[PDB]
Amino acid sequence: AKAKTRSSRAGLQFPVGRVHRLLRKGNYAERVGAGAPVYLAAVLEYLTAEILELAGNAARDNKKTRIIPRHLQLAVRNDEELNKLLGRVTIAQGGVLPNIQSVLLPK
Amino acid sequence: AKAKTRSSRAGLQFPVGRVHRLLRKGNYAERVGAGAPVYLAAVLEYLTAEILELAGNAARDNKKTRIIPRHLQLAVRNDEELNKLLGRVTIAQGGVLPNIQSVLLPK
Amino acid sequence: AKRHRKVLRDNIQGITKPAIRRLARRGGVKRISGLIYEETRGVLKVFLENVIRDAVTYTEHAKRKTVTAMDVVYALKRQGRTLYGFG
Amino acid sequence: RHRKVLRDNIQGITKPAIRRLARRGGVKRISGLIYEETRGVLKVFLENVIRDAVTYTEHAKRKTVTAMDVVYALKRQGRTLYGFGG
Amino acid sequence: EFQFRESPAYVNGQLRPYQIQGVNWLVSLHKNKIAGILADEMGLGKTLQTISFLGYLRYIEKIPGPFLVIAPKSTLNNWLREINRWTPDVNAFILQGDKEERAELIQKKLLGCDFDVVIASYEIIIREKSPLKKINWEYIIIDEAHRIKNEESMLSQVLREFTSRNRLLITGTPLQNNLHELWALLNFLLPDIFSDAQDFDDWFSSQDKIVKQLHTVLQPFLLRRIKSDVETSLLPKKELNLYVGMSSMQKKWYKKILEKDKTRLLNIMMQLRKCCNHPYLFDGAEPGPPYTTDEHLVYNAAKLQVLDKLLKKLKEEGSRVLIFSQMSRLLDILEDYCYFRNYEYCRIDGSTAHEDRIQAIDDYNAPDSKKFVFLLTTRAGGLGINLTSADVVVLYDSDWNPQADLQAMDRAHRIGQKKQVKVFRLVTDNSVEEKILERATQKLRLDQLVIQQNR
Amino acid sequence: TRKESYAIYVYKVLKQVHPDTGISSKAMSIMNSFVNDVFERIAGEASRLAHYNKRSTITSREIQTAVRLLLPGELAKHAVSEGTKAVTKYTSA
Amino acid sequence: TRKESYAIYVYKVLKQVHPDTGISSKAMSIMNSFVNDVFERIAGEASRLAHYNKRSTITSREIQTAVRLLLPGELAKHAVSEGTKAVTKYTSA
Amino acid sequence: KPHRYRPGTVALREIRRYQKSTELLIRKLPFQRLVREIAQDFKTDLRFQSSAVMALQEASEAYLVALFEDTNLCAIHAKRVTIMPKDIQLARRIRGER
Amino acid sequence: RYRPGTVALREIRRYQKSTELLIRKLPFQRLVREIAQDFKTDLRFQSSAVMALQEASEAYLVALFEDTNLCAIHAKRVTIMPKDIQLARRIRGER
DNA sequence: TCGAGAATCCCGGTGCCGAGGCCGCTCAATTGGTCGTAGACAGCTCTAGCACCGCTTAAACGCACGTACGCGCTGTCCCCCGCGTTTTAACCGCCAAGGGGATTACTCCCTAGTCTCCAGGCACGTGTCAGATATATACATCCGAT
DNA sequence: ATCGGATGTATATATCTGACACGTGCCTGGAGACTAGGGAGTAATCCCCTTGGCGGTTAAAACGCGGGGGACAGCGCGTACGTGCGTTTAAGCGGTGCTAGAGCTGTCTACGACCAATTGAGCGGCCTCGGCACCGGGATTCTCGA
Ligand SMILES: Nc1ncnc2c1ncn2[C@@H]1O[C@H](COP(=O)(O)OP(=O)(O)OP(=O)(O)O)[C@@H](O)[C@H]1O
Numbered sequence A, B: 001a002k003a004k005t006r007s008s009r010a011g012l013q014f015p016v017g018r019v020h021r022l023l024r025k026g027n028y029a030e031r032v033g034a035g036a037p038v039y040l041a042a043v044l045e046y047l048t049a050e051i052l053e054l055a056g057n058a059a060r061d062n063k064k065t066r067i068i069p070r071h072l073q074l075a076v077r078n079d080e081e082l083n084k085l086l087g088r089v090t091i092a093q094g095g096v097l098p099n100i101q102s103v104l105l106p107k
Numbered sequence C: 001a002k003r004h005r006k007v008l009r010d011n012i013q014g015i016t017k018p019a020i021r022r023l024a025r026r027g028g029v030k031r032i033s034g035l036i037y038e039e040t041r042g043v044l045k046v047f048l049e050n051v052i053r054d055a056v057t058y059t060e061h062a063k064r065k066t067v068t069a070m071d072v073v074y075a076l077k078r079q080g081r082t083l084y085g086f087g
Numbered sequence D: 001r002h003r004k005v006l007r008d009n010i011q012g013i014t015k016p017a018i019r020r021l022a023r024r025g026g027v028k029r030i031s032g033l034i035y036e037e038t039r040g041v042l043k044v045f046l047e048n049v050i051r052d053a054v055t056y057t058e059h060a061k062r063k064t065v066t067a068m069d070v071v072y073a074l075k076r077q078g079r080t081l082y083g084f085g086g
Numbered sequence E: 001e002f003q004f005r006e007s008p009a010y011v012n013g014q015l016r017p018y019q020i021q022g023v024n025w026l027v028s029l030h031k032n033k034i035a036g037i038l039a040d041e042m043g044l045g046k047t048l049q050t051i052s053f054l055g056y057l058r059y060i061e062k063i064p065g066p067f068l069v070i071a072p073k074s075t076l077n078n079w080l081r082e083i084n085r086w087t088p089d090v091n092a093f094i095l096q097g098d099k100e101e102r103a104e105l106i107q108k109k110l111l112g113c114d115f116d117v118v119i120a121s122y123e124i125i126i127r128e129k130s131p132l133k134k135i136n137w138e139y140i141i142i143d144e145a146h147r148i149k150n151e152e153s154m155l156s157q158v159l160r161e162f163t164s165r166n167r168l169l170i171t172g173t174p175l176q177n178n179l180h181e182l183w184a185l186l187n188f189l190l191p192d193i194f195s196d197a198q199d200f201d202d203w204f205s206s207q208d209k210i211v212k213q214l215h216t217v218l219q220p221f222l223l224r225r226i227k228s229d230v231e232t233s234l235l236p237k238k239e240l241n242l243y244v245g246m247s248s249m250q251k252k253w254y255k256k257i258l259e260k261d262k263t264r265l266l267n268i269m270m271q272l273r274k275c276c277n278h279p280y281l282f283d284g285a286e287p288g289p290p291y292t293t294d295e296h297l298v299y300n301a302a303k304l305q306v307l308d309k310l311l312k313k314l315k316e317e318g319s320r321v322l323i324f325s326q327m328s329r330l331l332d333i334l335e336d337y338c339y340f341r342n343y344e345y346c347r348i349d350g351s352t353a354h355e356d357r358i359q360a361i362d363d364y365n366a367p368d369s370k371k372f373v374f375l376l377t378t379r380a381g382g383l384g385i386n387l388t389s390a391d392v393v394v395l396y397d398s399d400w401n402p403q404a405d406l407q408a409m410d411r412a413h414r415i416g417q418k419k420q421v422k423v424f425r426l427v428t429d430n431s432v433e434e435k436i437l438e439r440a441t442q443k444l445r446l447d448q449l450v451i452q453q454n455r
Numbered sequence F, G: 001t002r003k004e005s006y007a008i009y010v011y012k013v014l015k016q017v018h019p020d021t022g023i024s025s026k027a028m029s030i031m032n033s034f035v036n037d038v039f040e041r042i043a044g045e046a047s048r049l050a051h052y053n054k055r056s057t058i059t060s061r062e063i064q065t066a067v068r069l070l071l072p073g074e075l076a077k078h079a080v081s082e083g084t085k086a087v088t089k090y091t092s093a
Numbered sequence H: 001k002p003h004r005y006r007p008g009t010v011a012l013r014e015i016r017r018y019q020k021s022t023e024l025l026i027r028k029l030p031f032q033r034l035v036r037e038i039a040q041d042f043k044t045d046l047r048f049q050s051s052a053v054m055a056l057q058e059a060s061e062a063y064l065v066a067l068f069e070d071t072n073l074c075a076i077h078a079k080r081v082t083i084m085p086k087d088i089q090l091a092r093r094i095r096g097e098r
Numbered sequence I: 001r002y003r004p005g006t007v008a009l010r011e012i013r014r015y016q017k018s019t020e021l022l023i024r025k026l027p028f029q030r031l032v033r034e035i036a037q038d039f040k041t042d043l044r045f046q047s048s049a050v051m052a053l054q055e056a057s058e059a060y061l062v063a064l065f066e067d068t069n070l071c072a073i074h075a076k077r078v079t080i081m082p083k084d085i086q087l088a089r090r091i092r093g094e095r
Numbered sequence J: 001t002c003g004a005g006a007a008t009c010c011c012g013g014t015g016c017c018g019a020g021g022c023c024g025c026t027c028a029a030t031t032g033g034t035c036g037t038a039g040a041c042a043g044c045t046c047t048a049g050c051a052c053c054g055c056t057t058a059a060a061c062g063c064a065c066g067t068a069c070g071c072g073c074t075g076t077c078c079c080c081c082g083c084g085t086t087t088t089a090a091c092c093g094c095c096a097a098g099g100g101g102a103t104t105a106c107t108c109c110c111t112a113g114t115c116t117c118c119a120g121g122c123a124c125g126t127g128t129c130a131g132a133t134a135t136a137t138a139c140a141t142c143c144g145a146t
Numbered sequence K: 001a002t003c004g005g006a007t008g009t010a011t012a013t014a015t016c017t018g019a020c021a022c023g024t025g026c027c028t029g030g031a032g033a034c035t036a037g038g039g040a041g042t043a044a045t046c047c048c049c050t051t052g053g054c055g056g057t058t059a060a061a062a063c064g065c066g067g068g069g070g071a072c073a074g075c076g077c078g079t080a081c082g083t084g085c086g087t088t089t090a091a092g093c094g095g096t097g098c099t100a101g102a103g104c105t106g107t108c109t110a111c112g113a114c115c116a117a118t119t120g121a122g123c124g125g126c127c128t129c130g131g132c133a134c135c136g137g138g139a140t141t142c143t144c145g146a
């Protein structure tokens, strides 16, 4: 019979088979269920789509057509849920958010 | 032949066999070497002896002959290495170190 | 009417001002402003909400209906503040 | 073969560089004693990170320190770094 | 041996013959170096018999000695006022008050040995146990001795540390729940003789193989006289079960509780009982604020609705009512109700202070007694006290233990009642109350149909 | 030798979201390390959940609980919805 | 059922260190948690070392490197000395 | 005239006596009520082990004591001796939890 | 001439808009080698390893300066000071 | 300044309770063989890290000046502390109920292991277009004379 | 308060260019089909631990009051730092050679997993006594008004 990828069966873009192999070759448990790779792949795809949407909006705001680490940093730091998720993370060539304390501004 | 514990063979007080089993059933790696349990048991015994000696001294300083959580807390927090190791650890019923800032003291 | 005597008007108010003063004294504080108590109550509520949410998640996964000390310990460890003396 | 310290390399972190880092941090005015303190802080941070990275390198039985060793060391200290592998 | 043919000479007043027989029983028990459970029915003068036995021990065997009397907090004054009345020559005090006054009393009288009888409560015995343990007690007497039915209770453990020459247990309801309670009471009297939990349980294992064995086993250690074969003048109680429906408010709330409808509801039965008693016991049911007591109370609670009519009718006939409850807040609701109906109540509960309890009892029992109803809780005010003035007992809600209600009703069916006592148990139809009534009936049968019947 | 990455899958997701936007190599490397990091966090939490409950199998229940534990607020709800939808679609086919 | 712990071993070490002091139940519980925590930290670091180096076996040198990574300063030297001495004594017999 | 201590002597006495002891400083029953009310918003009709509530109380008190030490440091840095809500806020901001 | 503080604000805006590295590369590389020679003699470094170290160091220093600025403003000042840095590190728990 | 005075510390005595010691299971650690594969060792290759040299020019360094900020001092006022009184809510023990958790036995179905394709992902050229660079321009803004 | 003039920044335009997106060939890892077995779900049991309300005791909390000392605003004064200029030096770029080291490959072989029998070590249960917690009473110390 013809072969159909588990990703296509689940309607995903991320690879279910690769995730299954990484789960069962990473010393996580003795056995891995059939639905665990599908669930994990769906979650990873969702998070990737979220970050990429925000970064694409940021890149459009600068009239650029390629996403760069600065755009990724802007997206992550301006979105509060993602900023909590990636609080202890450094993004190389990301920079900082523009923020000057109000007491330093001229009177 | 006559059974001899691996703790006895290594001159230890902690259970080499139990540590070996806990390594095997912990999903740490597919295979566990022969000297790994011996090394780990020796290290654990050393750390236990260090803490217990400091806590026994702290108990003696209060004219008591039984170690309590307060003595464990004093021992841990009064030396830098154990304080850095147990930096994010709360010891229940342990209290705090006596410490008053100097500017609060009367003139 | 003795039926309607009173309620404590919240449970967060049961963390009384003297208890907060005792905690501050153990922390080494000498004078305390009058606005410190509401702030402390809010901080304690946030901390408890986080820990209890994680503990209840553990309890539901275990399919139990009673929160256990082990669940609390795991939640604290997950939030990064390990607790010794309960399991 | 040959290796030595030349010109007391901690002073290569010049005053203008520290001022630029402070400006990126949002700092408007800088005391003249900040520079020595900053150099001490940076040296301590680098010492911890490099100690861990060299531990990884010599466990791997190598002589070259790799970006992946640095990344593992940072993850150990609790400062994940994206963009260099892993 | 000394069979004490007539009424005690030293005792003021004349005691009925069965009391003399009971005193003789106690004397015989004492001589044979054994201890028993004086377990006459609730209402016969067990306290008088105990006081007369103590008077015998002090005047015929010449042993004034130290005597300990442990009783519920509501009966300490009754014990004092009867010792001072039947044998008005015994030095007796009550070890009650603040821990400062208790310390003063200890230092003055207890450690100075300037006393004969020490009256104390179950709470002060566990609390002032170190000074009390320093006395070689001749007799340790426990009124309402079904409080030590659990051998693991701290009171029982504390009592098993005193030094006592002999012991006495008084209770009108010896058998409470199962047979292990009886063993717990007996192990206190005769620790050496019984000493055995499993042996007692399996010698008996709950036709004629065991019940007659029960009667022979407890024959030397237990004496019971029933109020029907002895008094034959007190009229027997006429108890009735008033089945009531539910109010629309009660129906709605009962449905909400059963259908799991933010408040925490972890004990379904207790919430259902609260609903069946009065819906206002739930926070938010009462319309308000502003909160008014005008009339809404009486009609949205079926029990209170029946109670209002019955209370009105009784006031017209000229009777006086005793109302018992399992809940103290429901007693507050009843307080507010008698406020609006302009009645004169005399509430006592577990939080009522000592002198307040004394004053309430005397006010309700005073001649011409202008108080109409007594509000009591079955636990605090349901033991030992002597409210013989009233004639109607209303059991607002039943208990899981039938004996806790028998005690309550017999606070009016006692010596010197000379009236007809009517008991009105209020039961709510198609609720959990019927379940608790059924379970209480089974527990009652367990003992009443079997052991205490032949006594 | 070959090295395995998430680059093509991330590019597919990007073309789904913004059909006309590119991505540079440094940003792609950052996204790759982000995916690896999140994978490791979720899988480690699921592993120790199974260890706590004395189970020797990692299932979608463990994955869902780990997602709830790790992700904050709205992210957790939407991720749980996505995973449940995928598992249902997979099982039905 | 049966709950295993490190209590007897901790007591043996205590009798070696201070022959005449005792220990309370709460203190023993704290010591047990400490031992379990340190075991978990070292084992986890050794496990991920083995994963990084594409090995499949946890060996005594993996344990040594994990100890060097975790313990601070002068603790690491003495712990490594103890571990090496024990392994030598064991292999000799 | 009666005997009154100066406005800052009893405070030092309490500091010493509370840093010397180890008991819990919050009442158990109010804390239990607070915990149950908070938990009721995540799952309805939960039961609690006594050891679970005890662990929660121990962790909470340790957390608050550490926060008060940090607050005291901030207040002293500002050249005061009274702690203030701004001091609490700064301490939580630097710690990375706000 | 610009008044004191105008150019400082211009620099703040410039450097919070840019993303490049603010320390020169050769001095930082020499510093890394010198520190590393106290752990193992005759080490070699990948260029990407040195770049990772610089990235991490600069991020750490910028975050520290943000916290120091907050502490200085709390003390009712606009100049950062060594006591401000020490307080920030003590609160973060690096002391 | 030195004499009350309230708090803390020893200190001997008592009790009480929790730590320590002893006695039967039972299960898990040890011993002895048997395999098979993960890793150690030797060899080779190519690549990338190091060392050197030369040029340029942009950044760092040292100096001077002047301003605005940090700091010290003063005064005020208000707010927090220390103390006393009363009561009310916590604490502990009691007493029921019953829900929920932990155990046991059974079975089935779900996952691992094996082998065989085959197609999807990776590495490798290859064009080409988004973006960085240089130049000119317009604008918003700051800072000093009316 | 308001104009004039420098000044730095953002904008538009044209130009490379090198990094990205695209197309091609391979191989390796994933999918299909089949088998076997053991992990987990299910049902029944029981007993234990939680819940809720009460009863009594009592110590902490809440409220009010009097006052002193700490926070905050205002002012004045050095002084330390920012701004700008001129000079030099060292970083960045590039190009080169080289050689040390990291990674790939093939070959054993010693070591770790597995398995079965067995015994002794650890746990749970049951006991006592010594350490520690009150408790009163005296001594010492420190504080606050002189
Ligand atoms: N011989 C007597 N003469 C007159 N009155 C008596 C006599 N004996 C008992 N009483 C009455 O009995 C009342 C005392 O109650 P009693 O001692 O019977 O309580 P009890 O029935 O022993 O206790 P409980 O009812 O709790 O079991 C007194 O009011 C007293 O008047």
Ligand SMILES: [Mg+2]
Residues within 6 Å of the ligand: E046, E047, E143, E384
């Ligand atoms: Mg009586």
